[PDB]
């Protein structure tokens, strides 16, 4: 007697308006909520790239600024190969942080007492890390090392308007050389977007990395960003940005009333479940229930819920960016753009009630099962060549160098790209080894081979089996 | 009474010349015009070219006389990062502008009067836009900025045959330095193609940005070409360019004579419609006809008319562009081009008849409804993914930076293009955030596996089962 | 009653011994063919990378010696941009040539009275090509051009052991200025091959390109080599090249014998068509015959005496090289390198007679008819976007330059290879007109998808149904 | 009567475990042991990356020490173009040797008598080879040359704490000149990994090449590395590596264990297979039995079984490594490597008692045979066109420049990978012969052609029917 009622919990919005008159209320919601959520990611991103771009620009002028004969893209091979070298780079870095406000373009502020835990008080730390003591002479093929670390800190401070030209580097035995500073700045090109720039405290360690002892020094420079709150602003404010406002209180009254219908679909769908239940049970046997309740429940409204609580989790963490409460631009992208990915997602649940528009949809439910069972065969395999590729290939293929880079690598073999650079890589250097360029022939070869040709064909040949299967409603 | 009627209006024009002895005039007239019109497409492009390579090589001879220390490949890094270097840019530009006649290999001409709105009737102008106020300290992390922008504006004159060096910027709050001028040279190379020579003048305006407020200023160059015909014109004449103007009569004519007999055919095509409709309204039911109105336009025929009237339009604006009426080499080009393309497609008009020459019309025309009910599932995966990679990797990734541009990279990675490129992007600066880096890595492995793997397979076994359909005749 | 012959003329090798007991002759025939010819083409590629290579590394030099400030990979940019760099340039160039010998590492000869058609018996010309007259005055927007081509040249003479410092440019007119002269030298690393070196007279010529007229001079090198005998050539002869003419008459002879067998199959194969001919016209009726005539011909033997053909016309100019009658490498290479395809081609007539082993050649029989039909349709609209992306995108993107290479770049986007950096090279200038890159977008997205989803899709499944009907035998 | 036996024999552990209550011992101790040899091979390839890394970064240091004006990423276009050049570059490599200790980063020493065999006995040897006499005359188009090689020493010793100065090269007959050295350092960073620094003895050779004898002579650096224990090391001793070892010794253990059992499976097999023989020979005829013995004997215990041989090779020139005596980090890589991912494979066999999950290889062991009967065709149309590419266009093209290249590029052509560059290579200069750029033309589309469109789907579509074939339990 309630066949009508099952009928009614599982036919589309048009066919709820066609027999209750029930307007698709959560449809056009759905709807809005693109809307919002997609705009408010753009507004967040506004001020995102700006906060980014600041960053990266005052790193590159920073290296600009401090690194001797530095140019652009040449990170990865800027070093120093004699002791002269060494010694006028470090000395340009501190000759250059002294006389910053004569020639810096930017306004930056010294950070007197901030030169890392090296410092003593003072403003910029130059640290040589050695040995504790190392008498290497290889001529004699003898050496005599104590692997504990000795470091000496030469404490520099900015004038309020020298000693480190004394620096005597060992050279024998030096691990690294540091430098430790740091720089206040006020991004002023916030005031684009109506709001008040902050201040931004650069810590910046340049390395001259000794570590590898080959004779060859690397030179890199890296800043950590702290973002804070200017503590005296004073901006005449030609705006405001009520326009986002508007959006953000928008888009948490959307995701709301969202949660409160996907919530009672779930609730009605759970009691239409536990209906059906004893209805079966009295009717038919016992214990008879073992699928139809995750039929019932409905896992695109369970998305939908989800997405809804990131996209509130995501508005509140850049409401408090905003107020300035908490400066974490990554983590508050991170969750606009996931949910921003998921509410456009989100809209295919209406396009499941018909077959014609539910292609993908239908494949991928039918598909997955066999499409896991194929890839648990496909892993171990795939893992295997992950180790051994990262392992022997790594030290000589520069896109072997780390597991995530031999995955990805592999990945795209998988789709037959940049398989000649793969290739030419070890060609260009025969690898040093013959050995080892014959090893990555028959590597690269058998894993090309094996997944392109044998293993994709069979993934394809499941989709498209689960697509037969679904071909006729 | 009429099937035979019907039968003469849907045969091939070989079944119309043994029925009714009809030579195919529209086949022909169609190859002749793919012949003339490109080849006029072909003319058309001769001085297309010169007019580009003008513009792009005298920005380019522009960019090496005015920008101090360029070089070819550096625009993206052409930047200044001291005061020192800021100031020697601004001179040099200036200068080299002042000896311009001097050193510079084209026969340019000083706009006396031209040098942009900031001008007031000088020749160059030297603006600095900086803040109303800006007191920037961000050592007491303190600042008092009022947002309006003033420009202190230095005129500089080139001599009939300075103050400029008294130059203050206030780096602390400029918001950017430009130098307008303008200069008038002669298209010589236009004679090799019996033209006559125009006028163009070039709008060179050169930024030094500072808008990021960040220690680096980039510097650009840009030019705005205007055309127009030169006022006093003397060429001894060694030819004209009658070939041009006899294919462009030619292809006239042709497209004329095309759409009378295309405007022939739609209308028999809309009276024999209407005549089957009566007589099936007569015999059968009334409001019978539904889609036999459509199976009587002929698209084709629409195709080559709307094609022929492109191709018109592209003709009298080339002609005209030789008359010097008006120069806009852009859209002629591309009104040019889509006409080449589109009577180059017209010509399989003729081939629907045979089966066997029909396999991609036949497949499109049964394959674009299920294709387009995929795609509209598919596209809002598309979107979602769109907007979530240029919001979050694109401050951070160089391949999403514009929304255009992350469209471009994901349709090239649906296609297994620029894989490991996409990957390495992120990997060689670990996007400054493990976070983000991890979402990259998330967000590309789950877009590849779903668009090539699952979505592609069933758009490709989608256009496989429509050819699998009309297989067989 | 000639049943049996017929079966005897269309068994294979294996069939033939059992019945007949003939040895297969043709097969290890062939195998020997492919030894020997692979083996004379590894030879001969010996010494034709020598001459490449001499003439490459010549050419480099030259570029190095006579171009001021150039530096390698930058051929393409390579340029003056002022009066002064233009005529340092020139100077340079000449005063290297001057001082050539007391400088340069290899040992180049001056050709005393080579210097071009513009010599009047000196070694060295540089000739400037201006306007008969040019008033180009664009500050009145005035130009009087008479476009006829005048050349002044200066004569220069390496001292057996000056006038061209009196240059003077016309820029304003000037078309280009170029410096042809000629130098001799031996290639003296064709003794690593036991060969006896050669005489290269290398012309060099140049250019300083003013035809844009754009302010920017383009300087390009340019060699045109001519190798010849030397009159007078002692070499202590440490060796010879007998195993090159072992290898040599071992192919000739090898070719000989397949030209003969394959001739008396094709004679028995006329012969048995027209026995076949008689026989069923005496039977059944006449004029039956209509394609059991191209059963009886084996398309495989005619590809034999082509092939063999090739080898012996590329074995004669090889002979002819070494014995330095003439000197056409890349002829000579092209020869034997498609004659060495060709037989290891060959070698799949003997697969055929085994359905396990001829999937390839059973397809291909089976699909080309359908392919080709198939291809008629798509080939019209790669012509049209061909024809339409040259001349319209050819100005501004750098894959579109000329109609081979547009062809090169569309059909590797037919295979998905360098999208991205298509899409990107009109990302970079925004196509310097925002409808010219909303063209461009067009444009690419309707090829790509109308190639890689829709025409692909139906060419492979057109193959695999080939294959499917083929598949059982 | 034993029909329950070879059922036992021949069921899943699991079915094992349920009729005869049998631990899987083997899958268990597969899962350890893929554990254990992954970790293993990590442990190594730490050591490993820190020896290439100090080769690689020694051979960098010394080229940007002893190479004038070297700037990295030009190795392949380093070279000298003038007769002072070449002089100032190899007196700049002596210099620099000779003040090596003053001016390098790292601890080099000078391997007193080690100059190489053409040494008496010094540390430095500057070799200049040329012909025993050459009278390069092109002038006079004569040349009288001796190819018999002299060499000429000069020794160079360092001071204990000149004349190489009155080098004289003969250019016009000049082979090449070499400078030989070797230098003595200790690998400190191996103390990072709580290991013994080791000797390393490189040997540098500084080639300037002048074999072409064509104005360039290319410059390059070599150097061989020997690793040697030092004779009196002396480490404080932080610590050691007894993890490394007992992560070797379980590696041995379980590999011997899983050695064991699968030998003890192999037995049992054969006798089972022998028992089987037998009953059919009592209760069929004779020799019945063809194949069931390969069904009895199981392949992936075999694989196993030669994987764990592999395992403890790799352990135990691991362990010798670590011992130090031998020092061949290359082979035991290689060995390491291919044992884990053999391991990581052989985890398949107990996947194919499920038809589920045995998808891979179940179409595999269908797919193979008529997989190599289809490449039995491919390859010898493969080889011609790789012959056929690298002889003629090697010379021009820079990805056919030798066997294995070409090879790369044809298989990385198939999967449509650097489609474009492959003809922009030969695009960018026309071949210098318009007729290898046709022949090019010609070869790159013929190829692509018939082995993306058509092999390349024949291919898919066998493994595809295979796949078909297995679909159904
Ligand atoms: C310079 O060398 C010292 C000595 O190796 C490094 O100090 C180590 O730093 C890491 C991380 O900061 C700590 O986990 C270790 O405990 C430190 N000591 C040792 C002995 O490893 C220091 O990190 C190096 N500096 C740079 C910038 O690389
Ligand atoms: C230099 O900076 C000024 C100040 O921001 C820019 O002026 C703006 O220009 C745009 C477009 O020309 C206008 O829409 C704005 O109204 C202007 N004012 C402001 C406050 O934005 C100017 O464009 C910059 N110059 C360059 C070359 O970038
Ligand atoms: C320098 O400019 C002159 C003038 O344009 C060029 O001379 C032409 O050369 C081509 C081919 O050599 C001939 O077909 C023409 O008849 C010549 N005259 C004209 C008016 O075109 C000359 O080729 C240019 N030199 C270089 C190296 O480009
Ligand atoms: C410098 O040139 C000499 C002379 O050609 C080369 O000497 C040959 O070296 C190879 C391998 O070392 C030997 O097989 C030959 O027998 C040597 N002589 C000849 C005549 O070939 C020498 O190898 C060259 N040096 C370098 C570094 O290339």
Same mark, same amino acid.
């Given at each position: 007697?309630?066949?009508?009622?099952?009928?009614?919990?599982?036919?589309?919005?048009?066919?709820?308006?066609?027999?209750?008159?029930?307007?698709?209320?959560?449809?056009?919601?759905?709807?809005?909520?693109?809307?919002?959520?997609?705009?408010?990611?753009?507004?967040?991103?506004?001020?995102?790239?700006?906060?980014?771009?600041?960053?990266?620009?005052?790193?590159?002028?920073?290296?600009?600024?401090?690194?001797?004969?530095?140019?652009?893209?040449?990170?990865?091979?800027?070093?120093?190969?004699?002791?002269?070298?060494?010694?006028?780079?470090?000395?340009?870095?501190?000759?250059?942080?002294?006389?910053?406000?004569?020639?810096?373009?930017?306004?930056?502020?010294?950070?007197?007492?901030?030169?890392?835990?090296?410092?003593?008080?003072?403003?910029?730390?130059?640290?040589?890390?050695?040995?504790?003591?190392?008498?290497?002479?290889?001529?004699?093929?003898?050496?005599?090392?104590?692997?504990?670390?000795?470091?000496?800190?030469?404490?520099?401070?900015?004038?309020?308007?020298?000693?480190?030209?004394?620096?005597?580097?060992?050279?024998?035995?030096?691990?690294?050389?540091?430098?430790?500073?740091?720089?206040?700045?006020?991004?002023?090109?916030?005031?684009?977007?109506?709001?008040?720039?902050?201040?931004?405290?650069?810590?910046?360690?340049?390395?001259?990395?000794?570590?590898?002892?080959?004779?060859?020094?690397?030179?890199?420079?890296?800043?950590?960003?702290?973002?804070?709150?200017?503590?005296?602003?004073?901006?005449?404010?030609?705006?405001?940005?009520?326009?986002?406002?508007?959006?953000?209180?928008?888009?948490?009254?959307?995701?709301?009333?969202?949660?409160?219908?996907?919530?009672?679909?779930?609730?009605?769908?759970?009691?239409?479940?536990?209906?059906?239940?004893?209805?079966?049970?009295?009717?038919?046997?016992?214990?008879?229930?073992?699928?139809?309740? @995750?039929?019932?429940?409905?896992?695109?409204? =369970? #998305? /939908?819920? &989800? +997405?809804?609580? %990131?996209?509130?989790? $995501?508005?509140?963490?850049?409401?408090?960016?905003?107020?300035?409460? @908490?400066?974490?631009?990554?983590?508050?992208? =991170? #969750? /606009?753009? &996931? +949910?921003?990915? %998921?509410?456009?997602? $989100?809209?295919?649940?209406?396009?499941?009630?018909?077959?014609?528009?539910?292609?993908?949809?239908?494949?991928?439910?039918?598909? /997955?099962?066999?499409?896991?069972?194929?890839?648990?065969?496909?892993?171990?395999?795939?893992?295997?060549?992950?180790?051994?590729?990262?392992?022997?290939?790594?030290?000589?293929?520069?896109?072997?160098?780390?597991?995530?880079?031999?995955?990805?690598?592999?990945?795209?073999?998988?789709?037959?790209?940049?398989?000649?650079?793969?290739?030419?890589?070890?060609?260009?250097?025969?690898?040093?080894?013959?050995?080892?360029?014959?090893?990555?022939?028959?590597?690269?070869?058998?894993?090309?081979?094996?997944?392109?040709?044998?293993?994709?064909?069979?993934?394809?040949?499941?989709?498209?089996?689960?697509?037969?299967?679904?071909?006729?409603?």
């Amino acid at each position: 007697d309630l066949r009508r009622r099952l009928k009614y919990f599982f036919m589309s919005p048009c066919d709820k308006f066609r027999a209750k008159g029930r307007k698709p209320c959560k449809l056009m919601l759905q709807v809005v909520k693109i809307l919002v959520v997609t705009v408010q990611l753009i507004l967040f991103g506004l001020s995102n790239q700006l906060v980014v771009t600041f960053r990266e620009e005052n790193t590159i002028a920073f290296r600009h600024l401090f690194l001797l004969g530095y140019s652009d893209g040449s990170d990865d091979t800027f070093a120093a190969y004699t002791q002269e070298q060494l010694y006028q780079a470090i000395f340009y870095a501190v000759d250059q942080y002294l006389i910053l406000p004569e020639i810096s373009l930017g306004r930056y502020a010294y950070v007197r007492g901030g030169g890392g835990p090296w410092a003593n008080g003072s403003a910029l730390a130059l640290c040589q890390r050695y040995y504790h003591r190392g008498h290497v002479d290889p001529a004699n093929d003898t050496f005599d090392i104590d692997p504990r670390v000795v470091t000496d800190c030469i404490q520099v401070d900015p004038p309020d308007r020298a000693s480190y030209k004394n620096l005597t580097l060992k050279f024998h035995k030096l691990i690294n050389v540091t430098i430790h500073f740091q720089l206040k700045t006020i991004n002023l090109q916030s005031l684009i977007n109506n709001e008040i720039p902050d201040c931004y405290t650069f810590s910046i360690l340049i390395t001259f990395d000794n570590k590898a002892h080959s004779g060859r020094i690397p030179i890199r420079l890296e800043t950590k960003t702290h973002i804070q709150e200017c503590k005296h602003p004073s901006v005449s404010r030609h705006g405001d940005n009520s326009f986002r406002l508007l959006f953000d209180v928008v888009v948490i009254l959307t995701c709301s009333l969202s949660f409160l219908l996907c919530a009672r679909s779930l609730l009605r769908g759970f009691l239409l479940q536990n209906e059906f239940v004893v209805f079966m049970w009295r009717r038919r046997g016992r214990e008879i229930s073992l699928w139809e309740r @995750l039929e019932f429940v409905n896992g695109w409204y =369970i #998305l /939908l819920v &989800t +997405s809804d609580v %990131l996209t509130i989790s $995501g508005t509140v963490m850049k409401i408090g960016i905003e107020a300035k409460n @908490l400066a974490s631009y990554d983590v508050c992208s =991170i #969750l /606009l753009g &996931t +949910s921003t990915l %998921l509410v456009w997602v $989100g809209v295919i649940r209406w396009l499941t009630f018909f077959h014609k528009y539910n292609i993908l949809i239908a494949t991928l439910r039918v598909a /997955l099962p066999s499409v896991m069972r194929f890839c648990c065969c496909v892993a171990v395999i795939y893992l295997g060549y992950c180790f051994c590729g990262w392992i022997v290939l790594g030290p000589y293929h520069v896109k072997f160098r780390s597991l995530s880079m031999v995955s990805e690598c592999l990945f795209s073999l998988i789709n037959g790209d940049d398989m000649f650079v793969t290739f030419a890589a070890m060609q260009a250097q025969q690898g040093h080894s013959s050995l080892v360029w014959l090893f990555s022939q028959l590597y690269l070869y058998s894993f090309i081979s094996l997944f392109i040709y044998m293993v994709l064909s069979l993934f394809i040949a499941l989709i498209t089996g689960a697509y037969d299967t679904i071909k006729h409603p």
